[PDB]
Amino acid sequence: FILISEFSDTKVFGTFDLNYFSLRIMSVDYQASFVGHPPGSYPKLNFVEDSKEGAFAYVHHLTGFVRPFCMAYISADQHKIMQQFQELSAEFSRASECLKTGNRKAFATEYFTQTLAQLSHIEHMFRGDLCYLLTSQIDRALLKQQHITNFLFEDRHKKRAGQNALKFIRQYPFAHPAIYSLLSGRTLVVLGEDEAIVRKLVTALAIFVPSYGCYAKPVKHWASSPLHIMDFQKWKLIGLQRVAGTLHALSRYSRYTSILDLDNKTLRCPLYRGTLVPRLADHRTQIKRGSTYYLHVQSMLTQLCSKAFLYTFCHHLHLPTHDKETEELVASRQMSFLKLTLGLVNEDVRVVQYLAELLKLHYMQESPGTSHPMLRFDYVPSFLYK
Amino acid sequence: AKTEIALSGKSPLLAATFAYWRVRHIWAPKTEQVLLSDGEITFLANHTLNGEIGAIDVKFFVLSEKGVIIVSLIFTYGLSIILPQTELSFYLPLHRVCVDRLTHIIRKGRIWMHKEIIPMLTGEVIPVMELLSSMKSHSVPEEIDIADTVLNDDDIGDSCHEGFLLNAISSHLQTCGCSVVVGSSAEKVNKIVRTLCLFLTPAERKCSRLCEAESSFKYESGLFVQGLLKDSTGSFVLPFRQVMYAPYPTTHIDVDVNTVKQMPPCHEHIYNQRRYMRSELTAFWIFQDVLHRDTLVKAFLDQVFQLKPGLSLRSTFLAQFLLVLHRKALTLIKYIEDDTQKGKKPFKSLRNLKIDLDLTAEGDLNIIMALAEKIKPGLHSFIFG
């Protein structure tokens, strides 16, 4: 909605949308001759109000006879531009140096598109709002602060991901144990034909996967192969297709799968009766525009990774406080930790029991599944849901 | 036609001038070997004055030629602030205390000239010089090393220090971040001001001020966390006037008695601020205690003191907690922002917001709601008032 243009004692050219429709009504000549030098103005730069709101008004010189030329901003409100003076000063005092240490060469238009691309990068990076830039500064500094737990869920296609995650969850029954299988370490082998449905289900459910390290994802998009245990090692959700068989030969690997069938509306995974996955994913949710839902899930998984950080780095749990260690004592003491303090119930202890192991493998050597392919599993019987 | 003042804790400023249509009076410190004379300040005030040809507008100017940075408000008349180009990041947090601190000077002096002025503005300029003299001397560092705080103490507290440590951080984060800690010594109030300043952004750190052992500071209505100590008699002064003039309410956290007092929420604070400002401009035309506790700060303070102190774990987990606080704030902003059509319809949607966003406790709603107000102003009036 906001505008950006030039000055001199009149308009030179618009840059935001190049003299667009009724979004731009007010004249630039109202802004012109009032943002120049009525004191007379070496690198002057100032900030007024002029109640739209007056904005950053870096005054520049060309010495050549055409000396008055300042470039000016404008936006909606006051504190967006006053509060962000530090990041509007040092991005126009350096973008002008293409023009300053540009056209200072030719007196003793080559860098014109440089200014008309850098300036578009300035309006594109300051396009959003005042709240969004403050939240992105705070999230930037805090993600600079923590450095271990960021890889687990650090990853606008996230809107299309989270919106299809919400359209997954409130429009598919028994998805609590599927998302439990994703968060627990059980390879969700998504099986079914009609490729694009499976791909959108894969990129929707890709948010919940705790990736191994500081590389991209363990997700696999639409593999077509018998899937012996080497694809179950390197990929934690797989997008197989039906051929009109594979369901019978795939059930031989029933210890490492959760076979979600699209053309049959069944799956095969253990029983989930816990409370963490229903608060990550409630059945009915009055949350609209699922990018908000992706912010909710990212906020919740940050707290989950904080619980896994806590369970990993407590000294009095993992170090045995005895001469000879007894796994009844340390297993019951770990279990007493995840029941009492963390407040987890009967499968969430398995979830945090897994994410802590990924966190150990990242901190110790920065290589799980590449040079240490662990693939921990369990003998819990999977039930055929219908 | 100028006066000179000399104060310990050397000045950051250069002068303070008033406009007529040039100078009428100059308030200057007694900084020995001043870098510049008076005529550049007078003629430079003539630069920043006559360039426009009701409310009170603000002007901000940075001169990289002589090396000054000018802040001024113009109402014909104009008050200006002269401070060098040696610092710019020093002033920029103090903008919202300097602007309103000079704006009420402009209101009362504007009515006082409307009844018809230098001696009625000596006592108005003389605090805001001492504020900037205080901020350079003590305020904070940005790097809060957490080795100096209540964290690392290996134990949260025996009987009452756990409840006071829960209510202090809890009531702090419920009251939009603004606090006042008062005491009779310096080391304890410094420990509570650093401990309580872990939970802020480094921009909001630079507003807040530490304690002072020797001289006399006062309350200010713009600092986030203040460490002003009590008198030798065992008392202090929190004036009812200027506490209302602060943009946010305030916790009166009191060490040595371990009580925690609060103020009403910020919609009633802005509303009663409008009541008291209007009803004090028509002349010649209260700490209500903590409502209820929370769950996130109880969980956090429960499970932090099991990690080790000196191994950089508590700061990591603390940054994770501030990360989930700010992300819950941003998804609360998004959920209000799309519940209505970004401020078209009235809100009417608190209950589903409380059950969906894991915020069924109101005392834990107030923290996320307070941060959401702090980086999106105008929510509490939209949903509560």
JSON list of C-alpha atoms in Angstrom, two decimals, chain A residues 92-281:
[
{"chain": "A", "resi": 92, "resn": "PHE", "atom": "CA", "xyz": [20.64, 4.15, 2.22]},
{"chain": "A", "resi": 93, "resn": "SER", "atom": "CA", "xyz": [24.03, 5.53, 3.30]},
{"chain": "A", "resi": 94, "resn": "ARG", "atom": "CA", "xyz": [25.50, 2.47, 1.54]},
{"chain": "A", "resi": 95, "resn": "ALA", "atom": "CA", "xyz": [23.08, 2.15, -1.39]},
{"chain": "A", "resi": 96, "resn": "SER", "atom": "CA", "xyz": [23.88, 5.77, -2.26]},
{"chain": "A", "resi": 97, "resn": "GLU", "atom": "CA", "xyz": [27.57, 4.84, -2.39]},
{"chain": "A", "resi": 98, "resn": "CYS", "atom": "CA", "xyz": [26.86, 3.02, -5.66]},
{"chain": "A", "resi": 99, "resn": "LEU", "atom": "CA", "xyz": [25.75, 6.43, -6.95]},
{"chain": "A", "resi": 100, "resn": "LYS", "atom": "CA", "xyz": [28.30, 8.42, -4.93]},
{"chain": "A", "resi": 101, "resn": "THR", "atom": "CA", "xyz": [31.37, 6.22, -5.64]},
{"chain": "A", "resi": 102, "resn": "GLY", "atom": "CA", "xyz": [29.57, 5.52, -8.93]},
{"chain": "A", "resi": 103, "resn": "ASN", "atom": "CA", "xyz": [28.97, 8.88, -10.64]},
{"chain": "A", "resi": 104, "resn": "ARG", "atom": "CA", "xyz": [31.94, 10.44, -8.83]},
{"chain": "A", "resi": 105, "resn": "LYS", "atom": "CA", "xyz": [34.01, 8.67, -11.49]},
{"chain": "A", "resi": 106, "resn": "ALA", "atom": "CA", "xyz": [32.57, 10.52, -14.50]},
{"chain": "A", "resi": 107, "resn": "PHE", "atom": "CA", "xyz": [33.67, 14.12, -14.09]},
{"chain": "A", "resi": 108, "resn": "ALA", "atom": "CA", "xyz": [37.48, 13.82, -14.31]},
{"chain": "A", "resi": 109, "resn": "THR", "atom": "CA", "xyz": [24.11, 5.73, -15.83]},
{"chain": "A", "resi": 110, "resn": "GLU", "atom": "CA", "xyz": [26.26, 2.61, -15.53]},
{"chain": "A", "resi": 111, "resn": "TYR", "atom": "CA", "xyz": [25.19, 1.93, -11.92]},
{"chain": "A", "resi": 112, "resn": "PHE", "atom": "CA", "xyz": [21.57, 3.00, -12.50]},
{"chain": "A", "resi": 113, "resn": "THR", "atom": "CA", "xyz": [20.00, -0.47, -12.43]},
{"chain": "A", "resi": 114, "resn": "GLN", "atom": "CA", "xyz": [22.17, -1.16, -9.36]},
{"chain": "A", "resi": 115, "resn": "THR", "atom": "CA", "xyz": [20.28, 1.56, -7.48]},
{"chain": "A", "resi": 116, "resn": "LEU", "atom": "CA", "xyz": [16.97, 0.50, -9.07]},
{"chain": "A", "resi": 117, "resn": "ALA", "atom": "CA", "xyz": [17.52, -3.07, -7.80]},
{"chain": "A", "resi": 118, "resn": "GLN", "atom": "CA", "xyz": [19.12, -2.38, -4.41]},
{"chain": "A", "resi": 119, "resn": "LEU", "atom": "CA", "xyz": [16.33, 0.11, -3.65]},
{"chain": "A", "resi": 120, "resn": "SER", "atom": "CA", "xyz": [13.71, -2.48, -4.61]},
{"chain": "A", "resi": 121, "resn": "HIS", "atom": "CA", "xyz": [15.51, -4.87, -2.25]},
{"chain": "A", "resi": 122, "resn": "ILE", "atom": "CA", "xyz": [15.15, -2.23, 0.50]},
{"chain": "A", "resi": 123, "resn": "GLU", "atom": "CA", "xyz": [11.40, -1.88, -0.01]},
{"chain": "A", "resi": 124, "resn": "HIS", "atom": "CA", "xyz": [11.05, -5.66, -0.34]},
{"chain": "A", "resi": 125, "resn": "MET", "atom": "CA", "xyz": [12.89, -6.31, 2.94]},
{"chain": "A", "resi": 126, "resn": "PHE", "atom": "CA", "xyz": [10.97, -3.50, 4.67]},
{"chain": "A", "resi": 127, "resn": "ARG", "atom": "CA", "xyz": [7.68, -4.37, 2.95]},
{"chain": "A", "resi": 128, "resn": "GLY", "atom": "CA", "xyz": [5.81, -5.96, 5.83]},
{"chain": "A", "resi": 129, "resn": "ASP", "atom": "CA", "xyz": [4.83, -3.94, 8.93]},
{"chain": "A", "resi": 130, "resn": "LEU", "atom": "CA", "xyz": [6.31, -2.63, 12.19]},
{"chain": "A", "resi": 131, "resn": "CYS", "atom": "CA", "xyz": [5.27, -5.63, 14.30]},
{"chain": "A", "resi": 132, "resn": "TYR", "atom": "CA", "xyz": [6.60, -8.26, 11.87]},
{"chain": "A", "resi": 133, "resn": "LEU", "atom": "CA", "xyz": [10.04, -6.66, 11.64]},
{"chain": "A", "resi": 134, "resn": "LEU", "atom": "CA", "xyz": [10.34, -6.48, 15.43]},
{"chain": "A", "resi": 135, "resn": "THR", "atom": "CA", "xyz": [9.29, -10.13, 15.78]},
{"chain": "A", "resi": 136, "resn": "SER", "atom": "CA", "xyz": [11.77, -11.12, 13.07]},
{"chain": "A", "resi": 137, "resn": "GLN", "atom": "CA", "xyz": [14.53, -9.20, 14.87]},
{"chain": "A", "resi": 138, "resn": "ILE", "atom": "CA", "xyz": [13.68, -10.93, 18.16]},
{"chain": "A", "resi": 139, "resn": "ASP", "atom": "CA", "xyz": [13.45, -14.37, 16.51]},
{"chain": "A", "resi": 140, "resn": "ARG", "atom": "CA", "xyz": [16.74, -13.65, 14.73]},
{"chain": "A", "resi": 141, "resn": "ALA", "atom": "CA", "xyz": [18.56, -12.78, 17.96]},
{"chain": "A", "resi": 142, "resn": "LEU", "atom": "CA", "xyz": [17.07, -15.71, 19.88]},
{"chain": "A", "resi": 143, "resn": "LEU", "atom": "CA", "xyz": [17.87, -18.21, 17.13]},
{"chain": "A", "resi": 144, "resn": "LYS", "atom": "CA", "xyz": [21.38, -16.76, 17.32]},
{"chain": "A", "resi": 145, "resn": "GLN", "atom": "CA", "xyz": [21.29, -17.47, 21.06]},
{"chain": "A", "resi": 146, "resn": "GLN", "atom": "CA", "xyz": [20.33, -21.15, 21.00]},
{"chain": "A", "resi": 147, "resn": "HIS", "atom": "CA", "xyz": [22.48, -23.28, 18.74]},
{"chain": "A", "resi": 148, "resn": "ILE", "atom": "CA", "xyz": [21.94, -26.96, 19.62]},
{"chain": "A", "resi": 149, "resn": "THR", "atom": "CA", "xyz": [18.19, -27.47, 19.33]},
{"chain": "A", "resi": 150, "resn": "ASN", "atom": "CA", "xyz": [17.63, -25.40, 16.19]},
{"chain": "A", "resi": 151, "resn": "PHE", "atom": "CA", "xyz": [18.21, -28.20, 13.64]},
{"chain": "A", "resi": 152, "resn": "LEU", "atom": "CA", "xyz": [15.23, -30.25, 14.86]},
{"chain": "A", "resi": 153, "resn": "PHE", "atom": "CA", "xyz": [12.62, -27.94, 13.33]},
{"chain": "A", "resi": 154, "resn": "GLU", "atom": "CA", "xyz": [14.52, -24.99, 11.83]},
{"chain": "A", "resi": 155, "resn": "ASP", "atom": "CA", "xyz": [13.68, -25.96, 8.19]},
{"chain": "A", "resi": 156, "resn": "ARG", "atom": "CA", "xyz": [6.07, -18.40, 1.36]},
{"chain": "A", "resi": 157, "resn": "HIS", "atom": "CA", "xyz": [5.69, -22.15, 0.88]},
{"chain": "A", "resi": 158, "resn": "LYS", "atom": "CA", "xyz": [5.32, -22.64, 4.64]},
{"chain": "A", "resi": 159, "resn": "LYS", "atom": "CA", "xyz": [1.81, -21.20, 4.27]},
{"chain": "A", "resi": 160, "resn": "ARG", "atom": "CA", "xyz": [0.99, -23.93, 1.75]},
{"chain": "A", "resi": 161, "resn": "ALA", "atom": "CA", "xyz": [2.64, -26.48, 4.05]},
{"chain": "A", "resi": 162, "resn": "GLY", "atom": "CA", "xyz": [0.82, -25.52, 7.25]},
{"chain": "A", "resi": 163, "resn": "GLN", "atom": "CA", "xyz": [-2.52, -24.93, 5.53]},
{"chain": "A", "resi": 164, "resn": "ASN", "atom": "CA", "xyz": [-2.40, -28.47, 4.16]},
{"chain": "A", "resi": 165, "resn": "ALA", "atom": "CA", "xyz": [-1.34, -29.61, 7.63]},
{"chain": "A", "resi": 166, "resn": "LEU", "atom": "CA", "xyz": [-4.52, -28.13, 9.11]},
{"chain": "A", "resi": 167, "resn": "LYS", "atom": "CA", "xyz": [-6.59, -29.51, 6.23]},
{"chain": "A", "resi": 168, "resn": "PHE", "atom": "CA", "xyz": [-4.85, -32.80, 7.02]},
{"chain": "A", "resi": 169, "resn": "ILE", "atom": "CA", "xyz": [-5.57, -32.84, 10.75]},
{"chain": "A", "resi": 170, "resn": "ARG", "atom": "CA", "xyz": [-9.18, -31.68, 10.99]},
{"chain": "A", "resi": 171, "resn": "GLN", "atom": "CA", "xyz": [-10.22, -33.68, 7.89]},
{"chain": "A", "resi": 172, "resn": "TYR", "atom": "CA", "xyz": [-8.63, -37.10, 8.56]},
{"chain": "A", "resi": 173, "resn": "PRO", "atom": "CA", "xyz": [-9.47, -39.38, 11.51]},
{"chain": "A", "resi": 174, "resn": "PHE", "atom": "CA", "xyz": [-6.84, -41.20, 13.63]},
{"chain": "A", "resi": 175, "resn": "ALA", "atom": "CA", "xyz": [-4.09, -38.73, 12.72]},
{"chain": "A", "resi": 176, "resn": "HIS", "atom": "CA", "xyz": [-2.91, -38.44, 16.33]},
{"chain": "A", "resi": 177, "resn": "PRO", "atom": "CA", "xyz": [-1.03, -41.80, 16.06]},
{"chain": "A", "resi": 178, "resn": "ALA", "atom": "CA", "xyz": [0.30, -40.91, 12.59]},
{"chain": "A", "resi": 179, "resn": "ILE", "atom": "CA", "xyz": [1.82, -37.68, 13.92]},
{"chain": "A", "resi": 180, "resn": "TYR", "atom": "CA", "xyz": [2.95, -39.73, 16.94]},
{"chain": "A", "resi": 181, "resn": "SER", "atom": "CA", "xyz": [4.77, -42.01, 14.50]},
{"chain": "A", "resi": 182, "resn": "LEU", "atom": "CA", "xyz": [6.41, -38.98, 12.86]},
{"chain": "A", "resi": 183, "resn": "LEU", "atom": "CA", "xyz": [7.49, -37.46, 16.17]},
{"chain": "A", "resi": 184, "resn": "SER", "atom": "CA", "xyz": [8.59, -40.82, 17.60]},
{"chain": "A", "resi": 185, "resn": "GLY", "atom": "CA", "xyz": [10.96, -42.15, 14.93]},
{"chain": "A", "resi": 186, "resn": "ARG", "atom": "CA", "xyz": [8.68, -44.54, 13.02]},
{"chain": "A", "resi": 187, "resn": "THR", "atom": "CA", "xyz": [8.88, -44.20, 9.24]},
{"chain": "A", "resi": 188, "resn": "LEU", "atom": "CA", "xyz": [5.49, -43.04, 7.98]},
{"chain": "A", "resi": 189, "resn": "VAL", "atom": "CA", "xyz": [5.41, -44.92, 4.68]},
{"chain": "A", "resi": 190, "resn": "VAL", "atom": "CA", "xyz": [2.73, -42.95, 2.85]},
{"chain": "A", "resi": 191, "resn": "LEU", "atom": "CA", "xyz": [1.38, -45.36, 0.24]},
{"chain": "A", "resi": 192, "resn": "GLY", "atom": "CA", "xyz": [-1.03, -44.66, -2.60]},
{"chain": "A", "resi": 193, "resn": "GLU", "atom": "CA", "xyz": [-1.27, -43.68, -6.25]},
{"chain": "A", "resi": 194, "resn": "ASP", "atom": "CA", "xyz": [-2.28, -40.32, -7.83]},
{"chain": "A", "resi": 195, "resn": "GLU", "atom": "CA", "xyz": [1.11, -38.68, -7.21]},
{"chain": "A", "resi": 196, "resn": "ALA", "atom": "CA", "xyz": [0.09, -35.07, -6.44]},
{"chain": "A", "resi": 197, "resn": "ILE", "atom": "CA", "xyz": [-2.15, -36.02, -3.49]},
{"chain": "A", "resi": 198, "resn": "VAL", "atom": "CA", "xyz": [0.72, -38.01, -1.98]},
{"chain": "A", "resi": 199, "resn": "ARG", "atom": "CA", "xyz": [3.19, -35.17, -2.61]},
{"chain": "A", "resi": 200, "resn": "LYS", "atom": "CA", "xyz": [0.93, -32.60, -0.92]},
{"chain": "A", "resi": 201, "resn": "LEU", "atom": "CA", "xyz": [0.42, -34.99, 2.01]},
{"chain": "A", "resi": 202, "resn": "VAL", "atom": "CA", "xyz": [4.20, -35.39, 2.21]},
{"chain": "A", "resi": 203, "resn": "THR", "atom": "CA", "xyz": [4.96, -31.66, 2.17]},
{"chain": "A", "resi": 204, "resn": "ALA", "atom": "CA", "xyz": [2.12, -31.11, 4.64]},
{"chain": "A", "resi": 205, "resn": "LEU", "atom": "CA", "xyz": [3.40, -33.71, 7.09]},
{"chain": "A", "resi": 206, "resn": "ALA", "atom": "CA", "xyz": [7.05, -32.69, 6.58]},
{"chain": "A", "resi": 207, "resn": "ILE", "atom": "CA", "xyz": [6.81, -30.09, 9.38]},
{"chain": "A", "resi": 208, "resn": "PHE", "atom": "CA", "xyz": [6.67, -32.64, 12.19]},
{"chain": "A", "resi": 209, "resn": "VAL", "atom": "CA", "xyz": [9.89, -34.50, 11.31]},
{"chain": "A", "resi": 210, "resn": "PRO", "atom": "CA", "xyz": [12.91, -33.96, 13.57]},
{"chain": "A", "resi": 211, "resn": "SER", "atom": "CA", "xyz": [15.69, -33.79, 10.94]},
{"chain": "A", "resi": 212, "resn": "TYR", "atom": "CA", "xyz": [19.00, -35.46, 11.76]},
{"chain": "A", "resi": 213, "resn": "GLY", "atom": "CA", "xyz": [21.47, -32.60, 11.58]},
{"chain": "A", "resi": 214, "resn": "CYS", "atom": "CA", "xyz": [22.32, -29.26, 9.99]},
{"chain": "A", "resi": 215, "resn": "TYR", "atom": "CA", "xyz": [21.36, -30.53, 6.55]},
{"chain": "A", "resi": 216, "resn": "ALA", "atom": "CA", "xyz": [18.04, -30.24, 4.84]},
{"chain": "A", "resi": 217, "resn": "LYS", "atom": "CA", "xyz": [15.44, -32.95, 5.58]},
{"chain": "A", "resi": 218, "resn": "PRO", "atom": "CA", "xyz": [15.09, -36.74, 5.79]},
{"chain": "A", "resi": 219, "resn": "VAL", "atom": "CA", "xyz": [11.92, -36.50, 3.73]},
{"chain": "A", "resi": 220, "resn": "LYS", "atom": "CA", "xyz": [11.55, -38.46, 0.47]},
{"chain": "A", "resi": 221, "resn": "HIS", "atom": "CA", "xyz": [9.06, -37.39, -2.18]},
{"chain": "A", "resi": 222, "resn": "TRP", "atom": "CA", "xyz": [7.38, -40.28, -4.06]},
{"chain": "A", "resi": 223, "resn": "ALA", "atom": "CA", "xyz": [9.85, -43.15, -4.17]},
{"chain": "A", "resi": 224, "resn": "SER", "atom": "CA", "xyz": [9.02, -46.24, -6.25]},
{"chain": "A", "resi": 225, "resn": "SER", "atom": "CA", "xyz": [11.05, -49.19, -4.99]},
{"chain": "A", "resi": 226, "resn": "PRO", "atom": "CA", "xyz": [10.53, -52.34, -2.86]},
{"chain": "A", "resi": 227, "resn": "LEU", "atom": "CA", "xyz": [11.97, -50.49, 0.22]},
{"chain": "A", "resi": 228, "resn": "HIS", "atom": "CA", "xyz": [14.37, -52.86, 1.90]},
{"chain": "A", "resi": 229, "resn": "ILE", "atom": "CA", "xyz": [15.98, -51.47, 5.04]},
{"chain": "A", "resi": 230, "resn": "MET", "atom": "CA", "xyz": [18.25, -48.89, 3.52]},
{"chain": "A", "resi": 231, "resn": "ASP", "atom": "CA", "xyz": [15.50, -46.40, 2.62]},
{"chain": "A", "resi": 232, "resn": "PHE", "atom": "CA", "xyz": [14.04, -46.86, 6.10]},
{"chain": "A", "resi": 233, "resn": "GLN", "atom": "CA", "xyz": [17.47, -45.82, 7.38]},
{"chain": "A", "resi": 234, "resn": "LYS", "atom": "CA", "xyz": [17.88, -42.59, 5.42]},
{"chain": "A", "resi": 235, "resn": "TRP", "atom": "CA", "xyz": [14.26, -41.45, 5.10]},
{"chain": "A", "resi": 236, "resn": "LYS", "atom": "CA", "xyz": [11.63, -41.04, 7.83]},
{"chain": "A", "resi": 237, "resn": "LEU", "atom": "CA", "xyz": [8.57, -40.64, 5.61]},
{"chain": "A", "resi": 238, "resn": "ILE", "atom": "CA", "xyz": [8.29, -42.20, 2.16]},
{"chain": "A", "resi": 239, "resn": "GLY", "atom": "CA", "xyz": [5.75, -41.63, -0.63]},
{"chain": "A", "resi": 240, "resn": "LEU", "atom": "CA", "xyz": [5.17, -45.03, -2.31]},
{"chain": "A", "resi": 241, "resn": "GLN", "atom": "CA", "xyz": [2.63, -45.68, -5.06]},
{"chain": "A", "resi": 242, "resn": "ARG", "atom": "CA", "xyz": [0.11, -48.42, -5.74]},
{"chain": "A", "resi": 243, "resn": "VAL", "atom": "CA", "xyz": [0.41, -50.56, -8.87]},
{"chain": "A", "resi": 244, "resn": "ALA", "atom": "CA", "xyz": [-2.69, -52.30, -10.21]},
{"chain": "A", "resi": 245, "resn": "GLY", "atom": "CA", "xyz": [1.25, -57.05, -4.08]},
{"chain": "A", "resi": 246, "resn": "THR", "atom": "CA", "xyz": [3.33, -54.37, -2.39]},
{"chain": "A", "resi": 247, "resn": "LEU", "atom": "CA", "xyz": [1.17, -54.34, 0.75]},
{"chain": "A", "resi": 248, "resn": "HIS", "atom": "CA", "xyz": [1.94, -58.00, 1.46]},
{"chain": "A", "resi": 249, "resn": "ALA", "atom": "CA", "xyz": [5.69, -57.79, 0.83]},
{"chain": "A", "resi": 250, "resn": "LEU", "atom": "CA", "xyz": [5.90, -54.49, 2.71]},
{"chain": "A", "resi": 251, "resn": "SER", "atom": "CA", "xyz": [4.24, -55.89, 5.86]},
{"chain": "A", "resi": 252, "resn": "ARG", "atom": "CA", "xyz": [7.30, -58.10, 6.39]},
{"chain": "A", "resi": 253, "resn": "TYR", "atom": "CA", "xyz": [8.97, -54.91, 7.65]},
{"chain": "A", "resi": 254, "resn": "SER", "atom": "CA", "xyz": [6.20, -54.28, 10.17]},
{"chain": "A", "resi": 255, "resn": "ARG", "atom": "CA", "xyz": [8.60, -53.23, 12.93]},
{"chain": "A", "resi": 256, "resn": "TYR", "atom": "CA", "xyz": [9.66, -50.02, 11.18]},
{"chain": "A", "resi": 257, "resn": "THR", "atom": "CA", "xyz": [6.58, -48.67, 9.38]},
{"chain": "A", "resi": 258, "resn": "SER", "atom": "CA", "xyz": [3.27, -46.87, 9.67]},
{"chain": "A", "resi": 259, "resn": "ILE", "atom": "CA", "xyz": [1.60, -47.72, 6.39]},
{"chain": "A", "resi": 260, "resn": "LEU", "atom": "CA", "xyz": [-0.99, -45.01, 5.72]},
{"chain": "A", "resi": 261, "resn": "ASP", "atom": "CA", "xyz": [-3.24, -46.04, 2.82]},
{"chain": "A", "resi": 262, "resn": "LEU", "atom": "CA", "xyz": [-4.95, -43.36, 0.74]},
{"chain": "A", "resi": 263, "resn": "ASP", "atom": "CA", "xyz": [-7.24, -45.58, -1.36]},
{"chain": "A", "resi": 264, "resn": "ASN", "atom": "CA", "xyz": [-8.12, -47.70, 1.69]},
{"chain": "A", "resi": 265, "resn": "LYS", "atom": "CA", "xyz": [-8.32, -45.15, 4.59]},
{"chain": "A", "resi": 266, "resn": "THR", "atom": "CA", "xyz": [-6.38, -47.40, 6.99]},
{"chain": "A", "resi": 267, "resn": "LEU", "atom": "CA", "xyz": [-3.04, -47.29, 8.76]},
{"chain": "A", "resi": 268, "resn": "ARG", "atom": "CA", "xyz": [-0.90, -49.68, 10.83]},
{"chain": "A", "resi": 269, "resn": "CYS", "atom": "CA", "xyz": [1.01, -48.22, 13.76]},
{"chain": "A", "resi": 270, "resn": "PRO", "atom": "CA", "xyz": [1.07, -48.71, 17.59]},
{"chain": "A", "resi": 271, "resn": "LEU", "atom": "CA", "xyz": [-1.53, -47.38, 20.01]},
{"chain": "A", "resi": 272, "resn": "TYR", "atom": "CA", "xyz": [-1.28, -43.70, 20.91]},
{"chain": "A", "resi": 273, "resn": "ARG", "atom": "CA", "xyz": [-3.01, -42.67, 24.13]},
{"chain": "A", "resi": 274, "resn": "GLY", "atom": "CA", "xyz": [-1.22, -39.51, 25.23]},
{"chain": "A", "resi": 275, "resn": "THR", "atom": "CA", "xyz": [-1.89, -35.80, 25.60]},
{"chain": "A", "resi": 276, "resn": "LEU", "atom": "CA", "xyz": [0.98, -34.07, 23.78]},
{"chain": "A", "resi": 277, "resn": "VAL", "atom": "CA", "xyz": [-0.10, -34.88, 20.22]},
{"chain": "A", "resi": 278, "resn": "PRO", "atom": "CA", "xyz": [-3.72, -33.70, 20.87]},
{"chain": "A", "resi": 279, "resn": "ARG", "atom": "CA", "xyz": [-2.38, -30.31, 21.96]},
{"chain": "A", "resi": 280, "resn": "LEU", "atom": "CA", "xyz": [-0.08, -30.20, 18.94]},
{"chain": "A", "resi": 281, "resn": "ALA", "atom": "CA", "xyz": [-3.06, -31.27, 16.81]}
]
